[PDB]
Each structure stands twice: as C-alpha cells, then as structure tokens.
Amino acid sequence: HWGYGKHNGPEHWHKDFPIAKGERQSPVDIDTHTAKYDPSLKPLSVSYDQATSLRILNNGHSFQVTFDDSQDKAVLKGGPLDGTYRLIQFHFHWGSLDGQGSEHTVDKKKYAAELHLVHWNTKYGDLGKAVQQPDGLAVLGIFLKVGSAKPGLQKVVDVLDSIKTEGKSADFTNFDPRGLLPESLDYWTYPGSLTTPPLLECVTWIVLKEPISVSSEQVLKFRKLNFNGEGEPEELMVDNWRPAQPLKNRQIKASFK
C-alpha cells in the first residue's frame, strides 16, 4: 500500500504505477515568467449553487468531502474546458509546517496547503470511465496560506475530530463549497494527472493564482488527523503531498495578463 513515508512514498510509486514517470504527470512547478497569457481562454464557470454534499471521509491519504454527482448540480465549465464537469469530491494536501504542503508550486514557492476540487466530464457517464480519458477530469486547485481564518472552511475543521483515523466517515450535508473560493478566478492551466495513485493522465488542471488564507488554528486541525486506522501506532497525517514533477513537453497557459 502506497503512502507518503520513506518506504512507500512518492519515489516508490513508479513500481506499482509506472505512469509515475509519464509524459504528463502532476503536480508541476508553475514558472510565472514562462507561462504564456492565452486570450483564447475563457472565464471559468463555477456553478456550485445547487451543490449537494454527502459525507466527509478519512481515506488514509487525506480527508474528502463527497458530493452527489448523479445529475448536473455543482459543475465546472468554460476556461480551457469543453463540455461539463460534475463536482464529485474535494480534499486537501498539507504540510507538517507552514513552509510546505502544496503540491503545485509557484516560482518554486510552496504553500501551506492545497485544496483540490475534483470534477469529471459528463460525456463519459461516470467517474470510472472518465479517468481513462485524457480529458475526463478537471481539477480546480486552490492554494492556502496561513493568516486570517477562512469562515467557509470552519464547518469542515469542526468535524475533523470525528474522522481521526483511516476509514472513518461522517454525515456532511448542506455544505456550500463556494465558501472555499478566493475572489479572483484568474488561473493557470496545463494537461496533467491525478497526483495520487493510480496517477492517471486524465486531468485538465486549473490552478487559481490567488490563494485563500486560513488560520493557524484551522490548519492545526488538519495536522491532528492520522494516516493509520484506529488502534494502530499513531502516525500523523502531515506532508501528504507529491513533489513537483518534470514538465516535459507541456505549456502552462495563463488566463490573465
């Protein structure tokens, strides 16, 4: 079973998942001076008004809030995307201290954490089918830095005590993911992959330039979670991020001048 530690972490993943050394792996460093502004790109369309959250879950590598994706309800359109992508889940990656935790980096800068809102392309019918297609997923990535509290995150942190260990879940209905968004929807975009095994190269990445700020107390709660299942030696869920991968033959485009 893969993980983030010395003997099962990111440098080991290629053995069970050889795509780990593929041509479109994520995350990557975003070099702000090399990324080209592309005026053909469109405004992102984030329509989360009808979002229906279901559960919050510790899956052993992060915690995720899941959504009902049986019909168009919370979807992402526009930007670099064709067609409609339904929100299935969001999760975070974070560090043991504030100077690391994000998966993408900006001019080698590491953020305290990174939020991933995962959406799949409706023209493939289900998530399972979408992940086997180069345009099957759109993941919206948002950086977190430490400062002021993020009110829309507080309902999430208040429940983390209840899902401390792997496998634990709780009801998490009536959560509005709009409260996790920054003001500007300016973004970078590039073709990439899932950043956890099986690391499938099925993702259009859309990373927002403006981070959201969260308080030290909020991110502290992230760090109290556990990779392990109940009763096992406590091994803190921290530094669950994959480092930046080779960009290779890819261009990162900017939606803004």
Ligand X SMILES: CC(=O)Nc1nnc(S(N)(=O)=O)s1
Catalytically annotated residues: 61
The answer on whether 93 is annotated among ligand-binding residues is: yes
Please report whether residue 153 would count as binding ligand X according to CB under 6 A.
Answer: no
Q: How many residues bind ligand X (CB under 6 A)?
A: 8
187-192 and 253-254 as β-strands: parallel, antiparallel, unpaired? antiparallel
Q: 59-89 as b/e, with b when 16 or more CB fall inside 10 Å?
A: ebbbbbbbbbbeeebbbbbbbbbeebbbbbb
Which helix (H) or strand (E) segment holds residue 218: the answer is: helix 216-222
The answer on whether 1 is annotated among ligand-binding residues is: no
- Residue number with CB closer to Zn ion (123 or 223): 223
The answer on whether 33 is annotated among ligand-binding residues is: no
- Residue number with CB closer to ligand X (19 or 33): 19
Mark 92-121 with x for binding to ligand X (rule: CB under 6 A) and - for no binding: ------------------------x-x---
Instruction: Name the DSSP letter for residue 118.
Output: E
CA nearest to 107, candidates 25, 10, 34: 34
Q: Is the dihedral of CA 126, 128, 134, 138 positive or negative?
A: positive
Restricting to residues 169-198, name those near ligand X by CB under 6 A.
Answer: 194-196
The answer on whether 196 is annotated among ligand-binding residues is: yes
- Residue number with CB closer to ligand X (11 or 230): 11
Look-up of token digits 């009801």: 171
Using CB under 5 A, pick the residue from 61, 86, 116, 209 that binds Zn ion: 116
Q: Which residues bind ligand X (CB under 6 A)?
A: 89, 116, 118, 127, 139, 194-196
Q: Which residues bind Zn ion (CB under 5 A)?
A: 116
